[PDB]
């Protein structure tokens with residue numbers, strides 16, 4: 001028993017991280033097959049980032065302007081292209097540690113593991129969630145760009161995130177592995193603000209089902225409510241409105257515990273309107289919302 | 302910026318995880334060079350765990366009775382031996398994915414990453430700390446035995462923990478890679494208590510420094526305190542007494558933020574007496590004690 005913020009093993013992703021240098025700028029790259037993926041702003045200087053013309057800057061670059069290295073050995077760039085905000089560097093050698101992989105664009109509320117890297121070497125792994133405002137609460141320093149987020153399905157590595165920038169609020173924005181930014185953010189060094197963030201309601205409920213499955217049940221009351229009554233109280237606390245799909249996703253967790261979903265919302269509505277009164281759930285004095293329903297089942301069984 | 306409970310990269314440890322089966326019991330093993338390390342209770346049935354005689358049970362076992370499987374390759378056992386509470390199975394070939402490694406016994410209050418494994422396959426990685434009562438608050442199910450905890454200095458893996466059992470209170474206990482249990486626990490399925498736990502004080506202060514590094518500074522007050530006055534508050538709230546060694550180890554973090562150590566103790570002293578007043582520190586409503594001073598510096602400098 002027990003419940004930890006658990007991240008996927010990072011072994012299959014470690015074998016793909018390289019170091020990409022263009023001029024004086026260095027970041028991390030993703031070496032899949034004979035292509036290296038990296039944030040396109042690697043071709044920009046500090047003065048370029050204030051208003052970059054990526055199409056004009058990239059065309060003035062040749063294959064020898066990029067220094068790619070996996071560990072110590074070098075990789076010869078034989079071609080370069082751009083796809084949205086991700087640079088694609090063609091190399092002469094295919095990565096012998098390329099795993100079965102996919103490029104997915106996840107939805108807000110989904111979770112993934114992050115492998116924080118610097119200069120092509122991993123620094124640590126942790127679990128993240130795509131916030132409703134299309135940001136992530138990560139742990140990134142200078143040189144962390146190019147780090148990727150991922151999930152593991154059996155033997156397949158689903159790449160869903162590539163790190164690009166830190167907003168002034170301390171949160172982080174990035175793209176999928178096709179270059180399309182999550183949210184309305186751009187890769188320009190101009191003032192950008194993440195929208196009003198909300199709480200992933202279906203993840204809070206799944207975390208409450210995890211506490212029951214682990215024996216924490218002091219919060220279960222004896223009342224019930226409706227989706228209309230709950231969402232009315234949910235909106236005042238900046239909680240995402242609960243839809244019927246969310247009720248269905250909580251289905252399997254409700255079956256194993258024998259606690260109805262609308263019953264669990266009433267306990268949450270009471271936990272919101274009355275606070276936690278200093279008590280703890282699964283070792284937390286707040287309401288945790290970075291566990292999807294699928295993560296709860298995958299960890300408890 | 303930001304601050305997450307970050308675990309070490311687990312690639313080097315993944316290549317050493319194999320499956321060990323003895324009859325119907327299956328658990329995980331650590332394959333380093335030509336030796337597979339696993340908990341010795343894999344040789345026990347459910348009836349033997351009530352009062353096992355491991356020497357007698359091991360004598361009735363032969364090399365071919367140990368089924369060691371590494372993914373899809375089946376390893377050939379050429380010998381077996383017992384060291385304390387771990388079984389050492391010598392296999393046919395040396396593990397080609399063996400990293401540079403060491404066997405270390407960690408102290409209470411220190412941290413490490415756990416690679417949870419089932420049937421020899423890695424399931425996930427998370428960071429945790431050895432509690433002062435020599436237990437860990439982990440996440441383990443049936444079949445998780447054999448999973449290991451580790452640290453990475455540079456390229457060398459410091460194995461420090463191997464999982465063995467879950468206690469009645471829901472916490473977990475295990476041994477080092479030499480078979481010596483952390484704590485007063487024996488590998489027999491009879492009631493065992495972990496004893497009273499405490500809160501790792503130096504870790505909380507290091508976490509407070511991590512909050513100031515990341516722009517979280519509302520808890521800084523206009524008060525200071527002495528080492529003795531702080532420990533009176535600490536013993537009241539079941540915190541480990543702060544020593545001079547703890548003050549010295551916090552030096553580097555005190556220099557990076559400009560906050561004196563005794564000033565930070567004053568801010569922690571106020572938080573212990575008054576609470577948080579409905580606010581958060583690094584996204585937490587509790588005082589976190591699973592970050593050592595070295596964990597903060599490693600994460601905040603990369």
Ligand SMILES: CNC(=O)c1cc(C2CC2)cc([N+](=O)[O-])c1N[C@@H]1CCCC[C@@H]1NC(=O)c1cc(=O)[nH]c2ccccc12
Pocket residue numbers: 041049140141142143144145164165166167168172186187188189190191192302
């Ligand atoms: C610090 N500001 C930014 O990171 C940033 C901000 C904006 C807009 C809000 C103004 C836009 C971009 N942009 O368009 O790329 C930004 N990206 C810069 C410029 C390009 C090259 C990567 C670099 N970022 C980092 O190296 C970095 C990433 C991170 O997660 N955390 C850090 C912590 C400490 C120092 C640096 C970073």
Ligand SMILES: CNC(=O)c1cc(C2CC2)cc([N+](=O)[O-])c1N[C@@H]1CCCC[C@@H]1NC(=O)c1cc(=O)[nH]c2ccccc12
Pocket residue numbers: 001342350441442443444445446465466467468469473487488489490491492493
């Ligand atoms: C549940 N009790 C124990 O785990 C346990 C307790 C004691 C004493 C305090 C009473 C001693 C041992 N022992 O000597 O091995 C124990 N170990 C058992 C018996 C041997 C074979 C491994 C097995 N462990 C697990 O399958 C298991 C490990 C875990 O982390 N969490 C689980 C969650 C749910 C069900 C099982 C487990």
